[PDB]
Design an enzyme around this catalytic site. Sequence first.
Site, short mmCIF file in Angstrom:
data_model
loop_
_atom_site.label_atom_id
_atom_site.label_comp_id
_atom_site.label_asym_id
_atom_site.label_seq_id
_atom_site.Cartn_x
_atom_site.Cartn_y
_atom_site.Cartn_z
N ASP A 1 -1.31 2.78 6.22
CA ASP A 1 -1.19 3.53 4.98
C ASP A 1 -2.54 4.20 4.67
O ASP A 1 -3.48 3.44 4.50
CB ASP A 1 -0.72 2.66 3.82
CG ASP A 1 0.75 2.37 3.90
OD1 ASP A 1 1.51 2.88 4.73
OD2 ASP A 1 1.20 1.59 3.02
N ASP B 1 0.27 6.85 1.68
CA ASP B 1 0.80 6.12 0.54
C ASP B 1 -0.14 6.30 -0.67
O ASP B 1 -1.19 5.66 -0.69
CB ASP B 1 0.91 4.64 0.90
CG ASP B 1 1.60 3.89 -0.21
OD1 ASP B 1 1.92 4.41 -1.29
OD2 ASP B 1 1.90 2.72 0.01
N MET C 1 10.03 4.50 9.01
CA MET C 1 9.69 3.23 8.33
C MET C 1 10.46 3.16 7.02
O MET C 1 10.81 4.20 6.42
CB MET C 1 8.15 3.14 8.08
CG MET C 1 7.71 1.81 7.45
SD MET C 1 7.96 1.80 5.65
CE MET C 1 6.48 2.67 5.15
N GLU D 1 2.15 -5.97 4.72
CA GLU D 1 1.02 -5.17 4.16
C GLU D 1 0.24 -6.05 3.18
O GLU D 1 0.82 -6.49 2.16
CB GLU D 1 1.75 -4.05 3.37
CG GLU D 1 0.68 -3.18 2.65
CD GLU D 1 1.29 -1.90 2.09
OE1 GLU D 1 2.43 -1.53 2.41
OE2 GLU D 1 0.53 -1.23 1.35
N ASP E 1 14.30 3.47 -3.81
CA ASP E 1 13.98 4.88 -3.98
C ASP E 1 15.22 5.75 -3.77
O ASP E 1 15.28 6.90 -4.24
CB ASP E 1 12.89 5.30 -3.00
CG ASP E 1 11.57 4.58 -3.22
OD1 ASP E 1 11.23 4.19 -4.37
OD2 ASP E 1 10.83 4.35 -2.25
N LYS F 1 -2.65 -6.91 0.24
CA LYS F 1 -3.29 -6.34 -0.96
C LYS F 1 -3.93 -7.49 -1.74
O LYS F 1 -3.31 -8.57 -1.82
CB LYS F 1 -2.20 -5.63 -1.82
CG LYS F 1 -2.91 -4.73 -2.85
CD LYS F 1 -1.89 -4.19 -3.84
CE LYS F 1 -2.53 -3.22 -4.83
NZ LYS F 1 -1.42 -2.57 -5.60
N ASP G 1 -6.13 -0.10 -8.17
CA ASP G 1 -5.76 0.74 -7.04
C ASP G 1 -5.39 2.15 -7.50
O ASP G 1 -4.42 2.34 -8.23
CB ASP G 1 -4.66 0.19 -6.14
CG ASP G 1 -3.54 -0.43 -6.95
OD1 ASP G 1 -3.80 -1.09 -7.98
OD2 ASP G 1 -2.38 -0.24 -6.51
N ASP H 1 -5.03 5.07 -5.41
CA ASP H 1 -4.09 5.77 -4.52
C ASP H 1 -4.42 7.27 -4.48
O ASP H 1 -3.50 8.08 -4.67
CB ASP H 1 -2.65 5.56 -4.99
CG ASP H 1 -2.12 4.22 -4.54
OD1 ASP H 1 -2.80 3.41 -3.87
OD2 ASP H 1 -0.94 3.98 -4.85
N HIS I 1 -6.46 -0.82 -0.27
CA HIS I 1 -6.35 -2.25 -0.48
C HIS I 1 -7.56 -3.00 0.08
O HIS I 1 -8.04 -3.90 -0.63
CB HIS I 1 -5.08 -2.74 0.19
CG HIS I 1 -3.80 -2.19 -0.40
ND1 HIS I 1 -2.55 -2.63 0.02
CD2 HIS I 1 -3.62 -1.26 -1.36
CE1 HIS I 1 -1.63 -1.96 -0.66
NE2 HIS I 1 -2.26 -1.14 -1.51
N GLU J 1 -3.72 -0.84 4.23
CA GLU J 1 -3.84 0.42 3.48
C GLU J 1 -5.32 0.54 3.08
O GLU J 1 -5.96 -0.44 2.70
CB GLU J 1 -2.96 0.33 2.21
CG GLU J 1 -3.32 1.45 1.21
CD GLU J 1 -2.21 1.61 0.21
OE1 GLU J 1 -1.05 1.71 0.66
OE2 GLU J 1 -2.31 1.63 -1.02
N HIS K 1 11.63 2.93 -0.08
CA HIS K 1 12.28 1.69 -0.52
C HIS K 1 13.78 1.92 -0.66
O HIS K 1 14.25 2.93 -1.18
CB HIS K 1 11.70 1.24 -1.86
CG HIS K 1 10.22 1.05 -1.86
ND1 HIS K 1 9.32 2.09 -2.08
CD2 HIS K 1 9.50 -0.10 -1.70
CE1 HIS K 1 8.09 1.62 -2.01
NE2 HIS K 1 8.19 0.30 -1.81
O1 LIG Z 1 0.18 -1.04 -3.64
C1 LIG Z 1 1.41 -0.57 -3.53
C2 LIG Z 1 1.80 -0.68 -2.07
O2 LIG Z 1 0.86 0.12 -1.33
C3 LIG Z 1 3.20 -0.15 -1.79
O3 LIG Z 1 3.23 1.28 -1.82
C4 LIG Z 1 3.76 -0.59 -0.42
O4 LIG Z 1 3.07 0.07 0.66
C5 LIG Z 1 5.24 -0.31 -0.30
O5 LIG Z 1 5.95 -1.19 -1.17
C6 LIG Z 1 5.73 -0.86 1.05
O6 LIG Z 1 5.70 0.30 1.91
MN LIG Z 2 0.95 0.93 0.91
#
Ligand SMILES: OC[C@@H](O)[C@@H](O)[C@H](O)[C@@H](O)CO
Ligand SMILES: [Mn+2]
Lengths: 385, 385, 385, 385
Positions: A243, A285, A86, A179, A55, A181, A253, A255, A218, A215, A52
Amino acid sequence: YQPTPEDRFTFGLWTVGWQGRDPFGDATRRALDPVESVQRLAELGAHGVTFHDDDLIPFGSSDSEREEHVKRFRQALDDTGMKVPMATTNLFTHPVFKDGGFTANDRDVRRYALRKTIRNIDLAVELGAETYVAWGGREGAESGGAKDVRDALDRMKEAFDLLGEYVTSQGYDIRFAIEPKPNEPRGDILLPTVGHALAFIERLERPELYGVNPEVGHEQMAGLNFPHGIAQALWAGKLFHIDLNGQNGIKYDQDLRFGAGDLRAAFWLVDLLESAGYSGPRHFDFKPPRTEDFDGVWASAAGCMRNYLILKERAAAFRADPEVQEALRASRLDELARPTAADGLQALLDDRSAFEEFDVDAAAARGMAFERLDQLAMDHLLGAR
Amino acid sequence: YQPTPEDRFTFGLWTVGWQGRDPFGDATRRALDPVESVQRLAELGAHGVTFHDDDLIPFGSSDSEREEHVKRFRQALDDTGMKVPMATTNLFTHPVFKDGGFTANDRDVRRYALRKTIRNIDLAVELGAETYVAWGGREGAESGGAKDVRDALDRMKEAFDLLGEYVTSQGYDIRFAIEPKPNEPRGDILLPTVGHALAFIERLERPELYGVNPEVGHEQMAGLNFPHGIAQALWAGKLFHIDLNGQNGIKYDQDLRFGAGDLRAAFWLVDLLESAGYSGPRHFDFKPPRTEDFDGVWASAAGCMRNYLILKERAAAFRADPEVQEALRASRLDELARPTAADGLQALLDDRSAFEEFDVDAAAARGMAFERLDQLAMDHLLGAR
Amino acid sequence: YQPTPEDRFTFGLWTVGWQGRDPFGDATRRALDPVESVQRLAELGAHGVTFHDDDLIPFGSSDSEREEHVKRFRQALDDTGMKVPMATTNLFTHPVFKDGGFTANDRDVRRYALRKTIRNIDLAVELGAETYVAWGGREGAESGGAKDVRDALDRMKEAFDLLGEYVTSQGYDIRFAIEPKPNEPRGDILLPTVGHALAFIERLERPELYGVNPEVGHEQMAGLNFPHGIAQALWAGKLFHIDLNGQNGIKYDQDLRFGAGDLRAAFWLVDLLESAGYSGPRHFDFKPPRTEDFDGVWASAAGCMRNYLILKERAAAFRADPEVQEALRASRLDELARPTAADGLQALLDDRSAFEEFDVDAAAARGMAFERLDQLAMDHLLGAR
Amino acid sequence: YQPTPEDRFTFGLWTVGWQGRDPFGDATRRALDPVESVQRLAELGAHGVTFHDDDLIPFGSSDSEREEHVKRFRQALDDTGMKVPMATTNLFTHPVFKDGGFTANDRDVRRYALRKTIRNIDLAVELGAETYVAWGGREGAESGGAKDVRDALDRMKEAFDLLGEYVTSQGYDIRFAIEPKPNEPRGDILLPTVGHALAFIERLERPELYGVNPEVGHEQMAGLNFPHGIAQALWAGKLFHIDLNGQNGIKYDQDLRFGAGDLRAAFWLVDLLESAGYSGPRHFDFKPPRTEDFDGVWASAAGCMRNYLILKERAAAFRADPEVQEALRASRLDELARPTAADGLQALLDDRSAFEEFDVDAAAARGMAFERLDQLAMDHLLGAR
Ligand SMILES: OC[C@@H](O)[C@@H](O)[C@H](O)[C@@H](O)CO
Ligand SMILES: [Mn+2]
Ligand SMILES: OC[C@@H](O)[C@@H](O)[C@H](O)[C@@H](O)CO
Ligand SMILES: OC[C@@H](O)[C@@H](O)[C@H](O)[C@@H](O)CO
Ligand SMILES: OC[C@@H](O)[C@@H](O)[C@H](O)[C@@H](O)CO
Ligand SMILES: [Mn+2]
Ligand SMILES: [Mn+2]
Ligand SMILES: [Mn+2]
């Protein structure tokens, strides 16, 4: 089972950098520097990282701190040979996004979300990213009157159409991956599965700019068959990125690292990506559990890659096995791949063996021999061949 | 709360005709004659009925019994003024369909499924049906090697493309509605949600022939927000028909009467159909519990209609209430319906108030006032206004 | 991975005898003779079989047909050396049980249920069964006013107390095992988990006569950790019998063969039964998918036993592995097994190192090293050691 | 629908004080002072509040700050007439509890957890609390080798036995209530349902000191019928306290206000508490959505109380309605409450009308008339009588 950077293994900064804050607990781990994570992930065999905006550059950064962060980062990629395939926007953490980004009821918020996204698209393109992911984790509702979903899908389409206009007016080679969810952190999230995100894309002005980023955990939070949803995305030509992680059924979730959770699903996902020849990043992820120190972090990111590589070898030995290939003909997989009526409608209609003289009792009596097949798959996954 | 045949209430033959056989129990109720059900449903206020082929004509019937059944049926419709807005194929009960109809691994089976479907399309058109539903309850798998999903989606597309070629070569005015279900009776069913069925339709040769038939309890078996999925189907223009019933969460498909199950979802579904002006049949695809005798059957089919009509009145009073309309402006529903940037990309990009001078702290501080809104909705549903 | 009759593998008659009727489909397989199943199961390596009353003797049988069935059966057991460790009542199929057996609202029904149960207890004891299972699949409700749960738990306790009085007045060595299930075929079933059935037992007049029969897929239909629930049953001393099968998450009860479904749960269940030294039958309560002919039936019953025996070997190699034993000390499993305060309350209260001088930051910093442990378990299950 | 402090409505400090931090987002609301919340909750009609240790006194406080906090608090209770019926320990937030409190693998941690709990028991008793709740949100695991559940249940029993020894050696009138939760924030939590917590209590040295604190949304996260579990707790005499809130099915714990979520369950819970005459606090353990400002907070805490009071009136009118009482006799609720065989075993065994001359076809034919009953309940809940 040693990765190399040819396996195309990638990790988000936020994954190994998760400090372990959860709805009921404080961080258990100090914040990693992005440059440390790049160097550690390179040693483990990874091929690149993703990020991000927030990040990499602390929310509210000046334009002189912004550049300092990016330059450091860039020196670490040059030093390790890691890529950035990405990139993505944080439109979920800040309180301003509490009702969404692109679908927030406040119009000023939705304009601010698009401006924050476009600024990071320029960055991504600078750092070489090919795919730009959009996870609208705040787009949804906890109650029925808060969101008109029709209006919200107009807003979402409007935002994605502007982003496609921006990318094609800059000349950028970059595609978008939505993506899905189904929930968490909203009560319900819009476009909650791969099938809703595929459908949505077919209404955008330029659908060929957009695919999906599904993902593991999800679709499994909806109780859905992840390999089935990825086969559909592949059939539509829209598997732009993926993912990977684990999830134990329908709950929050988790992960978990990839291969935890639903291990036979993980086998059938690997079988499918490899036999379809998906060639994107195998992106993890995941969150190392907050029980772990930084040693457990790097163990957990390693075991992602290791379980991928074990399950690839087991899937490859399954499909290569003459007894498996015989069982697949016993179960008529070969016939599934043939057209039902390439003779056409009329011929079908005049074919007495398709109705008037079809022996439905003899057909019903034939066994599909699926259980033998599935025990072969079991013996292969378990190395008990 | 008395229905009239203007409410557009319909019922399948199989619904009030369910004998109460379940995975662990024998029938508890004798088989109804279709003509009895037509006369009883007419007295309760229903506007028509729907049928599988094999509801109306016993599987294996001669062509002289076939016509006798249809003629009886037809006399009951003429005697009661009931319509037949929708018809469908049984491609799930007979053992020949144990691996599917249109996706069965055996090619001879898939040809037989299409022939059985086309024969009933001619019937449907004869009896006035406008919509022809396809629920592929046997299309799926219990294990990962049994079904290649790509090949299976080729077969499914192939079957639906032939049916569209047939309908348009006969000149028929009839459309198709695909009904999604995530599981049961297969381990996993193909096109398991509304979003997967919408996506799929966009790959058919003539997509405008096809929409969706979503059922309350099917999306709720995946934990999904049914009003959200129906808003998407409406946004895509593909809500061709709707199945109404109740379901208590993620478990077996209960098929409870409409308004049982998730009562606030039922409120928000009624609110949405009525304010979108959906004009199709309000079809009840439910099973009177096998605890009931035929008195409990007709009570349960009555309470479907009654709960629809109570929840329509409560939704109408909610939206009409000036205090609600004020709260909806307090929560910025009005702003959701406005374009984000009808000024266009460039203007957005040069707008300093959208980024460089956006006050993200003042925006974050604004409350969405959703809870007040939602308690207004609660007081209206409960008549506690 | 060859069973022998020392592995203690058992199967219900109803399991390999399932004809494949489901909520949407007719039987796909002819009815097996119990004597055939006994001979086929003996050849595969099984150690015995179990039965409902109505598996073995057709509901309504005279007392002269009743005995003919039993004598045939008995000759097959003598011919094959199979045992009958467990027997049970059918209080779910017949329409008379549509509201339950021991909790049916009609008192005459509840008396009839007890009489049908006692008649089969005498049979069971005659054929050597040690455990008598009670699965009240019809005890529950679809709606809230239909069942007062307090009254129903009085009735259930009353029925089980009479059965314990009967067994102890006959001098029988037989114990009872209650099998929990959360739903299906009732909306909700009473005593829906192992924890509800354990609690209930502690209110019976003679609790030592009663334990639990947990089934894999039943706790997994509630999203619960089956190994966790079995550890609790073991901790209470009440694991009298166990049903083994597979289940893919929270949905209808699939009854897949054992090792399908949740494969890592299956590993951890085997690890636990074997290291606790459970010595009862390993009973398979599963349905061969209705896609299968009788060849697929016997393949599926074989693969039950095979996957047990593979997962026993993998669990045994996991616990035997010095690196695993080192990791288990790294993660402080050894400390979990020590008393917290065998020094007693007072000492605890005067111990300054337990509070006033406890360094909570140094403790928080220690990593639990669970992920390394779990990847060792993964490498062992996969044979990738 | 105005509460008064006679309704016995209580709220945790942490409920209206939730700042809105979630797994993906920062706080959206400033920290409330406990004295403000006491004054605001008093104005809305509440009868008292509850607290964690660390709600009221900041973790690490000196003994001079500790007392300052308590004195302020106490002045607010004296100023408003609010009570403190229940108190509890925070053994989940601090990183030291990342593997649990009473079941943490580190023995030093488990001693520290007990010392932190005993210190707050003395406080609770000082402030008048009658019930001391224990929610072991960190007791569990994400992976199978991390926790031996037998050892962990020894540790848990050991901790609860010491706490009972402490309370009875001080002469305190205080009881303990264990609150079950199936997952979140651990992968799986020990004692995950009401039935597991009831069972566990029956192994403690003094079981009469312990009951349960069930919460609406926790059993619903397992897909369980909350009114059913509370009826069992009532039947065992162990409903010591209750947490009320809403939850939309099996997903993350939403903690919606009470009456959101599953509205018909909420009706049947109110019906049951009121007709059983439960006399404890009606405690709301909920989070105002992070979309809300402090106005939306106080709206949401108000609507808890309001929806309780509306659903009490609707349940009272349901049970009072002669037509309902007639339907309840039609459905044989009266017969459920009668003994099955108060004539005893022998009489049962000699009663020819219970078997040899029972007409099972005439009994099977009787309808249970549940659907009529349930539509009466529907018309009452909706005010559509
Ligand atoms: O549930 C959280 C989601 O999986 C998040 O990690 C996204 O993948 C990220 O914001 C975009 O890559
Ligand atoms: Mn993800
Ligand atoms: O789950 C069963 C499904 O709902 C079925 O009733 C279909 O709707 C019918 O076959 C087509 O109308
Ligand atoms: O869900 C069905 C249940 O598992 C059943 O097979 C019981 O185990 C049997 O009635 C008693 O043994
Ligand atoms: O899921 C969170 C849980 O509900 C918590 O609020 C407890 O109830 C509290 O720790 C003890 O009262
Ligand atoms: Mn339907
Ligand atoms: Mn069983
Ligand atoms: Mn709580």
